[PDB]
Design a protein that fits this description.
The structure is cut from a larger assembly and holds 9 protein chains of 9 kinds.
Chain F lengths: L4 E2 L48 E2 L6 H17 L3 E4 L9 H10 L6 E5 L7 H7 L5 E5 L5 H6 L2 E5 H12 L21
Parallel strand pairs in F: 3-6, 4-5, 4-6
Antiparallel strand pairs in F: 1-2
Chain G lengths: L5 H17 L15 H12 L5 H7 L3 H14 L2
Chain I lengths: L16 H10 L15
The chains are: A mainly alpha (about 100), B alpha+beta (about 100), C alpha+beta (about 170), D alpha+beta (about 110), E alpha/beta (about 150), F alpha/beta (about 190), G mainly alpha (about 80), H mainly alpha (about 140), I mainly alpha (about 40).
Bound molecules: potassium ion (K) (12 copies) and magnesium ion (38 copies).
The site of one magnesium ion (MG) has 3 residues of chain F, from loops.
Chain F binds 4 RNA strands through strand 1, helix 1 and helix 4.
RNA sequence: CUCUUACUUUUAACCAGUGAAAUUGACCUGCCCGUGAAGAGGCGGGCAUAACACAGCAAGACGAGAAGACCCUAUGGAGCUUU
RNA sequence: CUGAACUCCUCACACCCAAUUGGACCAAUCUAUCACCCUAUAGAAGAACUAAUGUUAGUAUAAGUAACAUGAAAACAUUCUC
RNA sequence: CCGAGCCUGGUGAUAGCUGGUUGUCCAAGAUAGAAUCUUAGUUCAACUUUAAAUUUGCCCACAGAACCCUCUAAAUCCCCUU
RNA sequence: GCUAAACCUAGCCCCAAACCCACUCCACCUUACUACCAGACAACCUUAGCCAAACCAUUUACCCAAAUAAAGUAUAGGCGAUAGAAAUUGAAACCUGGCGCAAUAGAUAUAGUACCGCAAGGGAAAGAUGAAAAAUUAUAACCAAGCAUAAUAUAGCAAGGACUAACCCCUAUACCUUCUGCAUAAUGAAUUAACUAGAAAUAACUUUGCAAGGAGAGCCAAAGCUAAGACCCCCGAAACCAGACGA
């Protein structure tokens, strides 16, 4: 019980496909491109996360002022509550002061 | 103390420390004496003399005050004709 | 669910050699999902365990329990199934080798109690397994006699060594 | 465990050492991999150590089967019929040289 | 985390709370150590040792007038106008060994530093740059990209 | 990791539907005390400490460090006899089988990275042979990276590319500290 | 279903061992099993016992009449 | 990434294999067997001090019995064999009493001889010389 | 999950097709004729 | 009540059918004295001791049930009154 | 004379303190590159349960216990008792 | 289950209080006290842990440390040598 | 040997992109889903409190129209807790992807259904053959607890040391939590499976790079500076406030 009786289907991986064979290309676009472009501009994803790093409270604060006017009402309400909970935890709870 | 502000997400400074203490770049904190303006008519000149003296703080106090202030108050400033300019660096200090 | 008991009557043994002894015939049969308790049925399968086919049918024919009328029906159709399908010459030359009960898939209903309380009762079900073997019932083992008790005791006194030495 | 395990009395194989000593280790079967980091220590043992180990033990037949494998093992068979299987997975040459010699010394 | 209390439950009081007695940072009187710190003028010191070192390496040419821009372009100083910096003050350190004929412009200068430059045949002048102009003089190129 | 963005996310006990009502009274029932049916202890409850994506892993090594790793990769390829200099990447035919038989006769390896100076001046002969192959990839000199050099066994550079690389990598060894981004006008940059 | 391969592979090995115990296979000759060289196993036989056997003679000491008679039966069926 | 324990079956079998011979539910239920497997390992680890103690207790009981057959007590045999420079331990002596009875009587007769020489010397004031079996070999 | 409750064997009594259709009428089980171009071979 | 008794019915117990609940660390679950988180089936010294069901009893398992409602504590609540 | 984990003897040695603190290893999972009967070096993380009157589900104990049910005969027509 | 209804939301309310807190192995490791609407807590010290720097530390010889005064106390402080 | 066990899909999550937005007929604001009669009722108005301040009473962050920086600076404040700008500066932008979950997970979801509630409202559970079932006397077995095959024999946390030998001999006061201290007759636990709990700044340390300079404008700097690594859990009240639903 809790463990499968048969072996799973093999996990076949193509190590020489397009995405793996051309990974890392143009990462030094700045050094070798006379600094016309910056590597962070090659990052794709949420517009509030491109070329930026932070903790959950920092990520949530950044999302609310960058795309908060476009968020769904229910999702925005949960975001504000998440920021309230994290504000109390980080600034009032913990082992160190 | 506020470790993460709700708008910027950065540490704040306690402004009750800035109105009482002075930090030398070396890491020392200078303060006044509690009671240097209270009931001078019942105190001796010797006691009043050491009450209006600017004294230093210890390790435990200075480490606390360093946590209650940000890096802006730890930078090296070059004010013009500062009375404490010569005190921002230690000399002939070992260990 | 498991249904291995029905697959044991499908094994085909290789032809025996001329000098080998006659192999007794084995007949497996069962009945599934009987509306009866396995604990109550166990007392009936324990009764005929080791009996002959004709003696077991006589004890189950005058028993007042409901399981008796069910087992007797399973024995009658295993008796015919033996001679018809498993090449058994005499229908009376059979004995109960194995007879036990198993738990079946049971249901769950609610039993109401006082003060707005409730219990969960289960409509119990059971299986019955039987194995018939060709031949007469193996003779019962005689009770141990005083000669065997003494013969065993003297054997323990002779098997004792000097312990914790060379 | 003692109560959770079996036991035996101290004994020998065919009163060994009484008239002459006969090495009980009879066969060694290595399974190394041409490629594989797990078998690195086993490959270096086959280049310099196994040949010199066979010169000292001429009564032991050593088989080296180089095949694809993730866990290399050495199988030791003894005169009495016992078979002990062991793994040399990610073991240095010094660890495998003392292991094989342990197998030769046992009964 | 320890056993029970506020230690294990993460409910310690704030930093600086001494358990109820008037804290240390509160029982000390107030004095104007840093009163108006944001409106004081600062001047990055430029020693004659530093200046002579920049000239011996070719990072600042003495054949042309030396102003605030050429010093920054040569990585001799780092001005922070946003940090209430108003320029550089020429200090007298390295006056004895200083040997160079230059035309330098510095917002502040000591009486001894002037003597060292006027002894070797040079000229020193003091000029004022406001915070806006001070940002343009140090980094002209970013200002020429504003179309102003 | 610098361009990685994890999209995994879970819902906390505050985001699971319902779970506002206290299941049963605090005392008397003889059961454990619970405030909501969506706490982590429950089946269908929130995740106590789970992923809170989208999460970013962005960070930057110093320019001089990233430029130095290229020197080491270019040095290790040569020391291990895995670097091959060319004068031009022009093949006689656009047959991909020719480029494969050519790397096997010279014993290059199973994977080869061909580096050209620009993306527009690439001969069409080599563009038609590497577009159909998987281990014979063609990149411009601007797309050179430590990861692709380590993934591929053999590195092939043209003479123009070599001069291009030395200029870029040696400019870090002799340059002032930046006053403003190198994308803005400078006295002697670019060239 | 849990993702992974190591535990399932390790569980298949235990099932085989359980199956062998429940249904142990019939014994077979060691020569039929892998890793066997008759010429190398018979030389060690002597060296193991510290005796200077003669291979030509020792190889005929293990050949039995019953084996020769059967070895011929196999050829006759195949006409060889 | 959600990770789950996939090999929890083997983690509990390496504990239950040591509980197979227990009685009751603590031979198949991990929660119960784990607490009894741990008590078994502690008992086996502390039992190595009892084994050595109970052996010497057994040897002494067997030597005491073999010495009374010759009219001796355990202290008079051990103490007077040491006085004859005979360094034989309890293990060997008890083994000799079972498998070499004629040699054990020779050791008891020796102890009784050395014991009687001690009394004779206690009656004199040193003038009389030491006994033949009371002499001590010196090692330089 | 993984729950299926099965009843004991029913063992239909009537084998003939007529009785099945004769008993399907008493039970109201209407079985309309089939419609298919494919036939067995 | 002295001072209880007899009978009927229900319950009961046996046969048949159906089939709950609180409870349960594991148990191969004795007595006396003593000991000890100060009141022992489990420790120490003694005595007792083949195994097993059914029906009764309520001395013990500090028996089950309800995170004591009495009392105290919390810089914990609430209702009422007030110069 | 008996008597320890004290001490000696053969061999080996990091291998018996709560909170706290320091350090050396590691299961499984995903990713990169290897490997190819199940592994390696690294990078990541919803990364490890004998205990929360814990959550859900399954099955036991109590327990085959408590408790539950159908007026009588007969030809199943009918009659009789209450 | 009205000394004041129920539902949802604020809400993951708060709780110095109780309970719970998941792989292996080794190591160091029991603490004068002060303040506090504070004594069921906390901060400072003290003890304790780790890294680093440097030079003394422990044990202790003479000599030396009060009159007033009842126990003319056991002792302590200081302290080279070792 | 029963009970069971085992599976991989259904679909979901997070981004990106793109603004979004119906219909057969009939019926539906009266007691909705009801063919047909005299009417004139009409919408707008500071959220509070929990919480923090170790009580509490002024006060206590909540997108408000550009990322960064200026800056946690000016400034506000039982000047306590905490709150907190601007001038000015000025960046990039190719939907069709995932070091996301895989039936106790992931949407509550097979469904806002069943069921509960007068109402507002609350709110589930689960499925699995095969190319073919017009091959169903089919897809082997081996695995939790619970039982069965197979009741029990002096004596005792149930074992260990052992032993020819299961037991007999000797030795041994369950675990966790909580405590000055628990075999304690103090707490919790029938058992199996699965689920179920340490989140981060300041400085400092370690290992690279460059070096009186460091950093991919901002910032630091009297050997510093850049980058990385590594430290701060879970469940639980009675309550308080707002807006609805109820005689
Ligand atoms: K904190
Ligand atoms: K009567
Ligand atoms: K009782
Ligand atoms: K009670
Ligand atoms: K408690
Ligand atoms: K308290
Ligand atoms: K309060
Ligand atoms: K659900
Ligand atoms: K507990
Ligand atoms: K107690
Ligand atoms: K209690
Ligand atoms: K207890
Ligand atoms: Mg009712
Ligand atoms: Mg606790
Ligand atoms: Mg405490
Ligand atoms: Mg909620
Ligand atoms: Mg709550
Ligand atoms: Mg969920
Ligand atoms: Mg009954
Ligand atoms: Mg209980
Ligand atoms: Mg007592
Ligand atoms: Mg009874
Ligand atoms: Mg008890
Ligand atoms: Mg209580
Ligand atoms: Mg309150
Ligand atoms: Mg001893
Ligand atoms: Mg010792
Ligand atoms: Mg040691
Ligand atoms: Mg491993
Ligand atoms: Mg976890
Ligand atoms: Mg578990
Ligand atoms: Mg639990
Ligand atoms: Mg009963
Ligand atoms: Mg009854
Ligand atoms: Mg809480
Ligand atoms: Mg220690
Ligand atoms: Mg006070
Ligand atoms: Mg001294
Ligand atoms: Mg408060
Ligand atoms: Mg209060
Ligand atoms: Mg679901
Ligand atoms: Mg089982
Ligand atoms: Mg006993
Ligand atoms: Mg107490
Ligand atoms: Mg005790
Ligand atoms: Mg208590
Ligand atoms: Mg952390
Ligand atoms: Mg209030
Ligand atoms: Mg209200
Ligand atoms: Mg009414």
């Amino acid at each position: 019980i809790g463990i499968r009786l048969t072996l799973p289907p093999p996990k076949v991986v193509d190590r020489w496909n397009e995405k793996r064979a051309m990974f890392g290309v143009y990462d030094n676009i700045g050094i070798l491109g006379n600094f016309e472009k910056h590597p962070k501009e090659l990052i794709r994803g949420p517009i509030w996360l491109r070329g930026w790093k932070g903790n959950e409270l920092q990520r949530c604060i950044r999302k609310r002022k960058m795309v908060g006017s476009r968020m769904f009402a229910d999702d925005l309400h949960n975001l504000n509550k998440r920021i309230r909970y994290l504000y109390k935890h980080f600034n009032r709870h913990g082992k160190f002061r | 103390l506020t470790y993460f502000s709700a708008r910027k997400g950065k540490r704040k400074t306690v402004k009750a420390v800035i109105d009482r203490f002075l930090r030398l770049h070396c890491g020392l904190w200078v303060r006044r004496k509690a009671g240097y303006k209270k009931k001078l008519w019942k105190k001796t000149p010797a006691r009043k003399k050491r009450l209006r003296e600017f004294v230093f703080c210890n390790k435990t106090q200075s480490k606390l005050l360093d946590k209650m202030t940000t890096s802006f108050w730890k930078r090296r400033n070059w004010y013009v004709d500062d009375p404490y300019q010569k005190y921002h660096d230690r000399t002939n200090l070992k260990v | 669910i498991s249904r291995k008991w029905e697959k044991k009557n499908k094994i085909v043994y290789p032809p025996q050699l001329p000098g080998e002894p006659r192999r007794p015939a084995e007949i497996y049969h069962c009945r599934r999902q009987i509306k009866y308790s396995k604990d109550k049925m166990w007392y009936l399968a324990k009764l005929i365990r080791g009996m002959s086919i004709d003696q077991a049918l006589a004890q189950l024919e005058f028993n007042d329990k409901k399981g008796a009328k069910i087992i007797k029906e399973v024995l009658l159709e295993a008796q015919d199934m033996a001679v018809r399908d498993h090449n058994v010459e005499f229908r009376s030359n059979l004995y109960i080798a194995e007879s036990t009960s198993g738990r079946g898939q049971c249901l769950k209903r609610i039993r109401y109690h006082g003060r707005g309380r409730f219990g969960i009762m289960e409509k119990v079900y059971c299986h019955y397994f039987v194995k018939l073997v060709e031949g007469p019932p193996p003779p019962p083992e005689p009770p141990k006699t005083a000669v065997a008790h003494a013969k065993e005791y003297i054997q323990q006194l002779r098997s004792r060594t000097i312990v914790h030495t060379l | 465990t003692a109560r959770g395990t079996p036991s035996r009395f101290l004994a020998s194989v065919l009163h060994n050492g009484l008239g002459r000593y006969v090495q009980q280790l009879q066969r060694l079967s290595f399974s190394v991999s041409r490629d594989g980091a797990s078998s690195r220590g086993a490959r270096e043992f086959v280049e310099r150590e196994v040949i010199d180990f066979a010169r000292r033990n001429p009564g032991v037949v050593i088989y080296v089967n180089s095949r694809p494998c993730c866990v290399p093992r050495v199988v030791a068979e003894y005169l009495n019929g016992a078979v002990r299987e062991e793994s040399i997975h990610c073991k240095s040459v010094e660890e495998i040289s003392t292991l094989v010699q342990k197998l030769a010394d046992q009964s | 985390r320890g056993h029970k209390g506020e230690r294990q439950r993460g409910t310690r009081p704030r930093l600086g709370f001494e358990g109820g007695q008037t804290p240390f940072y509160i029982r000390i009187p107030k004095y104007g150590f840093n009163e108006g710190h944001s409106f004081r003028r600062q001047y990055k010191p430029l020693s004659l040792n530093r200046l002579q070192y920049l000239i011996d390496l070719g990072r600042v040419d003495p054949s042309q007038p030396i102003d605030l821009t050429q010093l920054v372009n040569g990585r001799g100083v780092t001005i922070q106008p946003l940090k209430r910096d108003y320029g550089v003050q020429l200090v007298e350190e390295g006056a004895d060994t200083f040997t160079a004929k230059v035309n330098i412009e510095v917002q502040l200068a000591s009486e001894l530093a002037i003597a060292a430059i006027e002894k070797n045949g040079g000229v020193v002048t003091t000029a004022f740059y406001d915070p806006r102009s001070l940002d343009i003089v140090c980094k002209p190129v970013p200002f020429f990209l504003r179309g102003q | 990791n610098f361009k990685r963005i994890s999209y995994a996310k879970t819902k906390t006990r505050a985001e699971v539907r319902g779970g506002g009502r206290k299941p049963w009274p605090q005392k008397g029932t003889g059961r454990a005390r619970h405030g909501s049916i969506r706490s982590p202890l429950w089946r269908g409850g929130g995740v106590a400490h789970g992923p809170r994506g989208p999460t970013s892993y962005y960070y930057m090594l110093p320019m001089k460090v990233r430029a130095l790793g290229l020197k080491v990769a270019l040095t290790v390829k040569l020391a291990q006899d895995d670097l091959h200099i060319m004068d031009s990447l022009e093949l006689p035919t656009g047959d991909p089988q020719y480029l494969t038989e050519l790397a096997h006769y010279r014993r290059w390896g199973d994977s080869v990275l061909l580096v050209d100076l620009t993306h527009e001046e690439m001969p069409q002969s080599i563009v038609e042979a590497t577009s159909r192959l998987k281990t014979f990839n063609l990149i411009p000199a601007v797309g050179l990276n430590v990861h692709s050099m380590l993934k591929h066994q053999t590195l092939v550079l043209t003479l123009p590319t070599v001069a291009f690389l030395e200029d870029k990598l040696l400019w870090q060894d002799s340059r002032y500290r930046p006053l403003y981004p190198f994308s803005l006008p400078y006295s002697d940059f670019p060239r | 279903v849990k993702k992974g391969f190591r535990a399932a592979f390790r569980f298949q090995k235990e099932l085989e061992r359980q199956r062998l115990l429940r249904c142990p296979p019939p014994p077979v000759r060691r020569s039929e099993k892998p890793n066997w060289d008759y010429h190398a196993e018979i030389q060690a036989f002597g060296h193991r016992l510290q005796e200077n056997f003669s291979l030509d003679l020792l190889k005929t000491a293990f050949v039995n009449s019953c084996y020769i008679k059967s070895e011929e039966a196999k050829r006759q069926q195949l006409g060889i | 990434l959600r990770n789950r324990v996939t090999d929890r079956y083997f983690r509990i079998q390496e504990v239950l294999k040591h509980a197979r011979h227990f009685r009751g539910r603590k031979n198949r239920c991990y929660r119960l067997a784990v607490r009894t497997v741990i008590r078994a390992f502690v008992k086996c680890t502390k039992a190595r001090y009892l084994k050595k103690k109970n052996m010497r207790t057994l040897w002494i009981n067997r030597i005491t019995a073999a010495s009374q057959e010759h009219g001796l007590k355990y202290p008079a045999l051990i103490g007077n064999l040491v006085k004859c420079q005979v360094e034989l331990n309890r293990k060997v002596l008890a083994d000799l009493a079972i498998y070499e009875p004629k040699t054990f009587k020779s050791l008891a007769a020796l102890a009784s001889r050395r014991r009687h020489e001690g009394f004779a010397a206690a009656l004199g004031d040193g003038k009389e010389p030491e006994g033949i079996f009371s002499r001590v070999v010196q090692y330089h | 999950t993984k729950k299926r409750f099965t009843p004991p064997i029913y063992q239909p009594k009537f084998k003939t097709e007529k009785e099945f259709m004769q008993h399907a009428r008493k039970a109201g089980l209407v079985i309309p004729p089939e419609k298919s171009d494919r036939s067995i071979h």
